[PDB]
C-alpha cells in the first residue's frame, strides 16, 4: 500500500516491468518482437535454446535491447491504462544491459507475457530459472526483474486457476477484472466503468499490426523508417491495442536513448 495509516492497504503502487519485447534494427527497418516459446508441450523450459538465443542477441549487430515500461499496479487495468501519456512515455525505456543473465531475465519476462496457454508447470519452471538468474546477479536490476516476473506469473496462476506457494496476489486489477465477469449486470457494468475503463491513454485498435502499418505509410513516400510489431495476444499483452501505446513504442524503438541500468 501507499503507507497512509491503514485506510488504503489494498491499493498497490508496486512497480512491474511490462510490455517486454526484443528490438532489432537494420537498414531503415525496426522490429519489436516477443521472445519465442522456448518450452515444450508439458511446460519444460528449454534452457539450452533460451540461453543460446540470448547469447546470440548480445553479440548480434541488429540487437538494440529490450523495450519495456515500468507500470504501477493501480495503473494496469488489463486492457486500459490509468496513466497520462506524458508519464507513460517517461516510463518506457530501451534496456540493453551488458550482462547475459539480466538479458535472459528480460527474455523470460517477454516469454511470460506472450505465453498463449500457460500451464502451472511452465510457471514453476520459469520461476525456478529466474530465481537462479537472480542468485547469480544479486543486484537491483535483477531484484526488480525477479519481483516483476513473480508478479506476472502470479497474475496468470490466479487468473487462469492454474493451481488446484511461491506466488503473490499478482496485479490487483486483474483479480477485479476476473471477479466482475460474474457480478450481476448493472453492478458489473458500473464497477467496470469506475475501475477498469480509464480513458487517459485513449482508444484501442482492432489490429495493432495494421495500426503500425498505417503509421509507416505516412512517411513511405519520403523513405521514412519502417517500424513493425510482432507479439502474441494474451491476458498480459492487451495494452498493445492502445493506439497511444503503439505511437510511443514506435518513437522509443526508433529513438537513440538506450540505458544499461534500470534502477
Numbering used by the authors: 10 to 173, 179 to 277
What does the paper behind this entry write?
BBRF2 is an EBV tegument protein that has putative homologues in all three herpesvirus subfamilies. Here, we report crystal structures of BBRF2 alone and in complex with BSRF1. BBRF2 binds EBV capsid protein MCP and capsid-associated protein BPLF1, whereas BSRF1 associates with EBV glycoproteins gB and gH/gL. These data elucidate the molecular basis of the functional association between BBRF2 and BSRF1, suggesting a role of BBRF2-BSRF1 in tethering EBV nucleocapsids to the Golgi membrane during secondary envelopment.
As crystallization of full-length BBRF2 was not successful, we modified the construct and determined the structure of an N- terminally truncated version with deletion of residues 1−16 (BBRF2Δ) at 1.6 Å. The phases were obtained by single anomalous diffraction using selenomethionine (SeMet) derivative, and the final model was refined to an Rfree of 0.189. ΒΒRF2Δ is monomeric both in solution and in the asymmetric unit of the crystal. BBRF2 has a compact globular architecture that represents a novel fold different from other known protein structures. Arg27 on the bulged loop between β1 and β2 forms salt bridges with Asp85 and Glu122, two highly conserved residues within herpesviruses. Glu122 further stabilizes the conformation of the bulged loop through two hydrogen bonds with the main chain nitrogen atoms of Leu28 and Val29, and Asp85 forms a salt bridge with His253 from η1. In addition, these residues and two deeply buried water molecules establish a comprehensive hydrogen bonding network with Asn123 and ambient main chain atoms. All of these interactions contribute to a prominent hydrophilic core at the center of BBRF2. According to the Dali server, the fold of BBRF2 does not resemble that of any existing protein structure. Thus, BBRF2 represents a novel protein domain, and we named it herpesvirus tegument fold 1 (HTF1).
